[model samples]
Target chain A: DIELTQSPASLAVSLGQRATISCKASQSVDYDGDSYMNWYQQKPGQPPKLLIYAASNLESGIPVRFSGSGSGTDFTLNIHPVEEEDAATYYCQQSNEDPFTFGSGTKLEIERADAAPTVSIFPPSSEQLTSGGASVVCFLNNFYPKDINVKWKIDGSERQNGVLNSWTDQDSKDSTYSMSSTLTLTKDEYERHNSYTCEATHKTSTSPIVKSFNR
Target chain B: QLVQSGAEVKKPGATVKISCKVSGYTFTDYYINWMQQAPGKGLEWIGRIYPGYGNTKYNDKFKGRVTLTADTSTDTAYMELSSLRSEDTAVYFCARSLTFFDVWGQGTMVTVSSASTKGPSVFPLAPSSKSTSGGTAALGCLVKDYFPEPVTVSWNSGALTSGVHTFPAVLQSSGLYSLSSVVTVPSSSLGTQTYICNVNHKPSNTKVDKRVEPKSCD
Candidate 1:
């Protein structure tokens, strides 16, 4: 079986900087005077845009800033002086075989890095009833370089199995990200006063953002 | 078995740690590396750790904020980051390298968010029958417009252990999430039965259903 391995699952290169991505085929895909390798660019929520075909040759209407090279099993896609708008996922597909294969894509991220997120905690109001339990919300907002962990604790005990959970999501409306973890308190726990903590950890900080609420 | 910890959401300036655990192979005998994939972005190499000894190599951009470590007894590797930033919002993966990376942990997702959770608004879209391959009929339920992630799709409350394809929730352009589930039984087995796609949206603790009845290979 022919498979393509793309180097670096994702990347972020500065604007105006040269960005290079590589792809390696399991076997030589060259045949009939052509390498038969094609490269496509897929922006979010969009279909793939053919950038190069037959290895190094560029597709029509594409800018020279985007280029490809290498032959046989090795290939490279280059964007010299990459543009901010150049951010997208790049893929290398092989057409020489019956089961044409495409490599796992590489997502390109642009824009300068290095900004911390904001942390906020919201306690359950009278109406925020999550299965008849009191729920606490912790919102981590506006960070960059994209990663974090949220933990809910009660008196130093880590609590799992909370009500509802937050997967990853960007507040496209705010240009940053926004995720929340809602920790539900059982009816008995709701009636009892206890110290609850929301610990938010990010890579940009030396300490996790910690907030405690007593009810 | 290899596993990474759960998804994490943090504010900027917070610190986070991720763990990658593996078995069936010696953890210290191989080099474990980390990679990053931001939402709608490419995966970037963060660094690698030599658990056999105490060694690490990081990309220049990640040199300051990222840290890598491991434990021999537990067969676990760890990645820690400090001063979390918006760009750091991504999934982190730990891979074991031979001549090239051969085994990888399911990546851990870390998100930096400033938004609140609005419970799910679910709908089982109009159910229709389709003639699928291998000579069979199929029914589908579309669940849409939910905040955060996840839902359980069941047929007739059995919670369908098998014979169902539930699409993972997809984040829409408007910040909501959507997904669909489909099931197909052999045509002979489905004798005018009323099939229901019961969707239980977790965020709102709500349930919705849409029913479909299959005809012959029409």
Candidate 2:
């Protein structure tokens, strides 16, 4: 099951209070070629529209204040100049796989001018292909976390023994991480599936992921 | 786990007819299903109404039961659950078989505005009518935000029909993209034939009903 949790369940920050909602995936949702993170905002009587797909890329025509950052267990959907129309509810969704789940909506209300500015800076993308056997590897450049842990699985089945091997960074500004896991699969296992998950929490924020795979 | 379609009509203590128009290869062969969503509560899979062969299965809570039916000739399907109650004040949706519904219609609201003495009371308030008669029909596949990328729109009435099915470039701000598809199906085609809106979202597939039929309510 895909479990999601959102914080600041209800917020009354001002028009430009610099609002942010955090999505913590029970498991990493990284696919070989896709970053399976997305966010949406919903008002009453309307369908929820996609704000961010594949983690960071802004869906065409969206406001600039709405931005997404983070990868592998830690991510944030941020809104800069929050508007009155944005007063409804916001949610974060994981499209990695089923049961495709959503975070409880975060209710946003306009903050009064005299109200204290909430400087909640709890903040938080990219590609690669790796085999589904001994381990899964990922390197998110310009990320804050120094190291991350990896979990392995096959066909949604969790592999607890999977571990985070190490993290290496060539530049001080950029960070890189490496992970490995074992999948003890039989010959028929090839026909079935295999997957690995990478999970990590950072000093920067509170988000974790456990992505799976298939061989 | 997919959802199909269900119809909801309003009348004074009358039979409110509803249907779930479903497509997608996964659900077409499985079963056209139905469910009930009360305001602010979780969904309960009311029943699975098979359309192809005309069969049904209901949740023990919904047994006795809700009627699920389909019309494969038009590739259209429906759920005719009777005995309405004001407590049933929630949105209703359809799905594919017993699992979660992948394809869903913009939930049809069945508000029992009028109190009933016997079976059930359903009433239609102001703004009683919305039509798709003109050349353009406002259509959408019921999906929460982050609808899979690369969504495709087409008519599946057995012929290669083309039309302008456009969704807004900025979907997030609008909550829902304003979808418009100008298909030249016969007026009869609009009501009887099945027009499918398909999306190949990852993990699952979903289809919404393009053809709508106005059912008579009591």
Candidate 3:
């Protein structure tokens, strides 16, 4: 695939929480300079709106709240206090090469469950750069079919999970699986490593890639 | 709303000239602008010109540099970029800039021809010979074939990549449309790299041309 990978394919953030999405490329971008990493917000079926272009330069008419940082290999898209208007899957596309590719979608603003346990997913543990949140990022591995209700909780309380929220409901070259869901979290404090759990409440797969960040 | 056809201009060494014909609106009131497109796709903003007042505006990123002029008497506008270079490769187009671009020219394309490999290339300007000291250069692109749409210009070497829009001309003269823009390339970057003119129209493409050797300051 011409595109790279995105973490925390799905996320649920609170009203004023910070949310980020990472876009990684398989190889260095096409241009001699840094990759022209851009971020966009896709609301349902609207045109993919440009939130940030050329890495961090805000489009002429865009709001100042949405911002982008980093260059070349690593890039980040940060949104302040995830709002309803900002409650859509965010995608990262690199213009540094031909046949541009986009990061798998990150679904944002999952409907907050009133009765069910709410979950908050931060960053994960990786020798590679991490989103810097809790312990382990959920959904890094695939033990189940892609799409399912995945949640994160802090000490039993529901908190906004992962950096970005995204979901792609499509079959791969083969028909064995239909979709791919991912959630990325960062390890917070070493002490809280054993206190976290990545729980998937899907009917098809009960514990698909579920693990304890603390342990 | 749109334009149809124009002369296919080729500048061997010096800058070439081109024009667009907009026939749907009243030409007396609306402003006409210019844009550029690469060989197969993508559009970029070069500059814009107003036919009513002969007033022209450049993208601060492309001003001083580009000079846009117009002639309303004949219901036509003209564009001229000096010091031809390869970076100017792309189809040049025009549209309304002051307001939203609802009116546009079909776009005209001008290619800057290079000297032949075996024979000494013929240049249009007085100083046909190469110079030791470098200076600024210019080129022009005319667009045709589409309207009320978006097109872009992308310079492979320069630090500019953006889309431009044009003003809709009022229907004044029957079957008449006019628009133009000029792109001025700084003398500092005459021999840097290739330039691409892109059109974003669905099933659109871009045009590319190599720049001739730059002449030194007189």
Candidate 4:
């Protein structure tokens, strides 16, 4: 039984909220100083996409919102707001213990009722302000299924070079979620008083939510 | 990465050497430890080697039987054991250690066979301290994989108070257990104040003290 490959096989997470799935190996998959475990996602007839490799490292081209943690017998795959496109089967594969072993597949069913995230932009932290550049942290709260995307725009130009996204966090009490993304600007850009926008995209809204900051 | 081979087979009186090499970290900053695992027994600590200073410490049982060495230039650690016997026919492991052993090498099975009893007798088994983050700085200490009985959980050398929410143990299918103790305090307290989760596992006579330090908080 490949050392009893196993998982729960099913999950139901609301749209714009986080989804957590567990995969437990029958034995420790740790060897060679790292957990030789992997994760993949399969959608219908499409080929599987490798989501996590070596237990917790994200695959090169995967989304930053997807994460993996834990080791040995216990492991988890997290989708920060499982998008509609993510409704599929996920599997855990171990490479250390035995012969090409893989665990049972767990399917993700996106729960109904979409919710929009409450968005806000905070000025650069005192530490960040004191640094060479200016950084603003934009946070989104109460989002469902974690389907929100944040973009930084300065005077109409979309900026990507200096933007960093953080892991979306969840509320255990209400199932709602939150996330913060940091956008940094150079000293010249901060002093010019240019118009910067934090554009948020969610399934619940037709137009993107924009929070502006005048630098 | 700590690299070691799959297995090694030896005979009585043969000299054997095992190597564990590392990557992605400073080779000499932390000590490397060696351990032994017999088929029917618990894991026994062999020794630890300070790669930077070449100071090797050994268990009293293995003191004169084994030698631990490190080559700082190659970022590799080596273990040499002479007078190998069937009693030494067990898996050997090398690990990176500081406060605790976090990373382990792929075990090297040095199966030493001899002219003697080829049978079985068996029994089998098996974090740390102090101190450190979150807002209100809600820090939760979770202790898992311990077996049998309950443990004493404390906060800052005080009783289990301070917005404490202690959960009962969940019996794992393997008959072992896991539990959690959560504490909520103001985010400001972590820097000037000391809030710790001291988990006392009586059976093992070990205590894990974890605290909320300001640098890890928001």
Best by lDDT: 1
TM-scores for all predictions: 0.47, 0.39, 0.29, 0.34
Q: RMSD of candidate 4 to the true fold?
A: 21.0
Give candidate 2's TM-score.
0.39
| Predictions: Cα RMSD each | 18.7, 28.1, 27.3, 21.0
For candidate 3 chain A, the 10 contiguous residues with the lowest summed lDDT are A171-180
- The lDDT values for all models are 0.66, 0.46, 0.46, 0.64
lDDT of 2 by residue, A156-176 (tens): 555564222322211211112
lDDT of 3 by residue, A1-215 (tens): 35667777877665667888777777665365545777767554233456776677776777777888877677778887566567567877665643345677677653222222112222322222233332223322122233456555555544464423333221121111111122334444433534555565754433443433323
Q: Relative to the true interface, what fraction of contacts does candidate 2 keep?
A: 0.00
Worst 10 residues of 1 chain B by lDDT: B122-131
Q: State how far residue A118 of model 1 sits from its true place (Å).
A: 1.1
Q: Which CAPRI tier for candidate 1?
A: incorrect
Worst 10 residues of 3 chain B by lDDT: B117-126
Query: How are the candidates ranked when ordered by TM-score, highest leading?
Result: 1, 2, 4, 3
Higher-TM-score candidate among 2 and 3? 2
Q: For candidate 1, give fnat to 2 decimals.
A: 0.04
Q: Model 3, stretches more than 4 Å misplaced?
A: A30-34, A110-215, B1-218
Q: What is candidate 3's CA lDDT for residue B146? A: 32
How far does residue A61 in candidate 4 sit from its true spot (Å)?
Answer: 41
List the candidate 4 regions with Cα displacement exceeding 4 Å: A1-10, A13-112, B1-218
True contacts kept of each: 0.04, 0.00, 0.00, 0.00
| lDDT, model 1 | 0.66
